Design brief:
It is a single chain. By secondary structure, this protein is α/β, with parallel strands linked by helices. It folds into 2 domains: 193 residues, Metallo-beta-lactamase, Chain A (4-Layer Sandwich); 148 residues, Rossmann fold (3-Layer(aba) Sandwich). The chain is 26% helix and 22% strand. It contains 8 helices and 18 strands. A 7-stranded mixed beta sheet has the order 13-12-14-11-15-17-16, sandwiched between helices. The longest helix has 18 residues. It starts with 6 loop residues before the first strand and ends with a helix. The structure holds nickel (II) ion (NI). The PDB classes it as hydrolase. Keywords: SGC - Diamond I04-1 fragment screening, PanDDA, XChemExplorer, hydrolase. It forms a monomeric assembly.
């Protein structure tokens, strides 16, 4: 049974609610982005209307084989009428094709569902600037002040400089980057660009990347691993055993691996600056964990909500424990008292 925080009151609509079977009363199913916790349940046998971005729609059709007749892509930043209700999709600054959804209820209520997002001051100048929001369905993944991490730009600066140094010292070093879903593509694309290489990867991963409308992509990626000195591998293989085994396969072309694991937040964030990050090393293999986040830090979250001034907040993440829920509710009230709404 579908939980309440995936239902939009006063509509026939659900958000990210594909694993509950046929939801009673649902005339349109929205999908914010193509991450498995959110799409869980979609397949070629789904026969209800799915509303999403163009990029999400490319992925539904090519990766999950959803039939074309049930996929309804919408342009961003554009007022659209769905089953008699005005909606707008906004960029969520999450993974490619990820959106927030503004719903303009027939009774005059305005609702924002963030999906998964990384808040940014640029959102304060989208179509959100123009009206009041009564209810906010909020990605609270990192809603506690211990969650700090650097900008995405500082993280990519670290990665490019690290990769370029290592390979210039040893032209026989291979760079490897971990992946398990879409998102975080700037990591491997930025490093390949500084090295003058294409990124090499499996046919399944190449297929996924070809659905993402990234400019000039045929110029940046390839399935010919032999022509590439930046390889992508599944995240599970980014360990000393898995990397050793990969290096065997490269036929003595390389004698060192430098590897990157983009994580979310990790507790080494509470002590160490990005500049000071060091790898784990065994022999001719080094692994860097880099805190490249596609979710709001606590401060970024707080700034967005204090700017938006919603009347009511409904968390969509960390909702399963009473201690989590109580913690989040305390921060929401602080924010409201400090800002005066
Ligand atoms: Ni996500």
């Amino acid at each position: 049974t579908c939980p309440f925080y995936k239902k939009i009151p006063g509509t026939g609509f659900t958000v990210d609610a594909f694993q509950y079977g046929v939801v009673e009363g649902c005339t349109a199913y929205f999908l914010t982005h193509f991450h498995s916790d959110h799409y869980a349940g979609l397949s070629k046998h789904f026969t209800f209307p799915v509303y999403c971005s163009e990029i999400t729609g490319n992925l539904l059709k090519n990766k999950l084989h959803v039939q074309e007749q049930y996929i309804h892509p919408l342009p961003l930043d554009t007022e659209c009428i769905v089953n008699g209700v005005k909606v707008v999709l906004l960029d969520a600054n999450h993974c490619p094709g990820a959106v927030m959804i503004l719903f303009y209820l027939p009774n005059g209520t305005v609702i924002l569902h963030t999906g998964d997002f990384r808040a940014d001051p640029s959102m304060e100048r989208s179509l959100l600037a123009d009206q009041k929001v009564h209810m906010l369905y909020l990605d609270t993944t990192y809603c506690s002040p211990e969650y700090t991490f650097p900008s995405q730009q500082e993280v990519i600066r670290f990665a490019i400089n690290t990769a370029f140094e290592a390979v210039t010292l040893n032209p026989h070093a291979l760079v490897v980057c971990g992946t398990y879903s879409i998102g975080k593509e700037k990591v491997f694309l930025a490093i390949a660009d500084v090295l003058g290489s294409k990124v090499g990867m499996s046919q399944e991963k190449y297929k996924t990347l070809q659905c993402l409308n990234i400019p000039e992509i045929n110029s940046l990626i390839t399935t010919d691993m032999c022509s590439s000195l930046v390889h992508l591998l599944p995240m599970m293989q980014i360990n000393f055993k898995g990397l050793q085994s990969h290096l065997k396969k490269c036929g003595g072309k390389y004698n060192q691996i430098l590897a990157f694991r983009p994580t979310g937040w990790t507790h080494s964030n509470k002590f160490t600056r990005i500049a000071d990050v060091i790898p784990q090393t065994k022999g001719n293999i080094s692994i860097y964990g880099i805190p490249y986040s596609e979710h709001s830090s606590y401060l970024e979250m707080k700034r967005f909500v204090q700017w938006l001034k919603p009347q009511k907040i409904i968390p969509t993440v960390n909702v399963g424990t009473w201690k989590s829920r109580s913690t989040m509710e305390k921060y929401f009230r602080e924010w409201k008292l400090e800002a005066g709404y």
